Amino acid sequence: MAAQTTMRINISTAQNSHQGVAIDTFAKEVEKRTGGRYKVQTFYNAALGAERESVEAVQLGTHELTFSSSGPIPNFVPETKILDVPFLFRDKAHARAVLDGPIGQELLTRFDGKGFKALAWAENGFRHMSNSKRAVKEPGDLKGLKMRTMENPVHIAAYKGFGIVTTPMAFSEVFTALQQGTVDGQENPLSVIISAKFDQVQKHLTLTGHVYSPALFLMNKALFDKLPAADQQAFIDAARQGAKLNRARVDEDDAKGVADLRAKGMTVIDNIDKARFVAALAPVNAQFEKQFGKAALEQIRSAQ
Numbered sequence: 001m002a003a004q005t006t007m008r009i010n011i012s013t014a015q016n017s018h019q020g021v022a023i024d025t026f027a028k029e030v031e032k033r034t035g036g037r038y039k040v041q042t043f044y045n046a047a048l049g050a051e052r053e054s055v056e057a058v059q060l061g062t063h064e065l066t067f068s069s070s071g072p073i074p075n076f077v078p079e080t081k082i083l084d085v086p087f088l089f090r091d092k093a094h095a096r097a098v099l100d101g102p103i104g105q106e107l108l109t110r111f112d113g114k115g116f117k118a119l120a121w122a123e124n125g126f127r128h129m130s131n132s133k134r135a136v137k138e139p140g141d142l143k144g145l146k147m148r149t150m151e152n153p154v155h156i157a158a159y160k161g162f163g164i165v166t167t168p169m170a171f172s173e174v175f176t177a178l179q180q181g182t183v184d185g186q187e188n189p190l191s192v193i194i195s196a197k198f199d200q201v202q203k204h205l206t207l208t209g210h211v212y213s214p215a216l217f218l219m220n221k222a223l224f225d226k227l228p229a230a231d232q233q234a235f236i237d238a239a240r241q242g243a244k245l246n247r248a249r250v251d252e253d254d255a256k257g258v259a260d261l262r263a264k265g266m267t268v269i270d271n272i273d274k275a276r277f278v279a280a281l282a283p284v285n286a287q288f289e290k291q292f293g294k295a296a297l298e299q300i301r302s303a304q
């Protein structure tokens with residue numbers, strides 16, 4: 001009898017997180033939907049690499065699958081940059097609808113020519129600013145903060161627009177950098193801040209919600225293409241189910257997160273005027289309009 005094929009998938013976050021739910025659900029569904037013919041071993045906390053290294057590894061084929069935020073993706077697939085524009089998405093429902101519908105479907109196609117099968121869009125969440133130095137109540141309070149960023153050119157340009165001094169770093173370095181005070185802060189969804197225990201190394205958090213962070217199930221293209229057609233469908237369907245449970249965990253994290261982090265001693269600013277943060281980014285946003293075009297930005301904004 002043919003040997004079960006085993007593949008590996010990893011993330012940079014904890015098993016007990018929104019992304020751990022994503023990959024564990026995916027793995028369970030692949031095994032079920034392929035009648036046990038495929039099995040997926042799951043790795044966490046940047047085992048097998050943090051996100052950029054892992055996306056590269058999947059492209060090379062050194063392991064088969066990864067689940068990553070959109071953060072490091074533009075280096076590989078430039079077309080996703082528009083998703084990383086600050087304040088583009090009104091809320092999670094808007095973002096999820098865009099990604100699941102034809103706009104997001106078109107973006108999945110852009111991975112094919114770069115050596116991936118992008119199985120499905122999933123979610124990291126809306127990102128929020130934390131730091132060790134001071135409470136952030138207005139955009140001016142961000143000026144001069146030394147902040148870690150992802151390896152993403154849109155985020156870096158945007159945050160420089162707030163006067164932040166940016167340091168791109170792989171996620172596997174971040175807890176220690178915060179602890180050592182190399183940087184004052186970072187930015188991430190509540191799902192990450194909670195699961196990574198950043199309350200232990202960050203006194204301040206503001207719910208700026210300044211960008212939406214999608215995530216992706218990625219597979220090596222050559223490997224995906226060699227699967228029998230029915231198993232290709234099983235992998236896609238498993239990824240979509242992983243996205244569903246992932247998003248549900250994000251919802252739970254976002255609902256409980258302010259109370260959870262306050263109880264852990266963080267000062268959490270959840271009353272800001274977001275419109276002032278948008279206004280502060282006007283010059284950078286004018287650049288993004290020139291870069292992406294009004295047509296593409298309005299196409300996303302129009303979405304229901």
Ligand SMILES: CC(C)(CO)[C@@H](O)C(=O)[O-]
Nearest residue numbers: 012069124150171188192
């Ligand atoms: C935590 C993370 C790896 C999750 O995708 C990402 O948001 C990041 O690098 O900050």
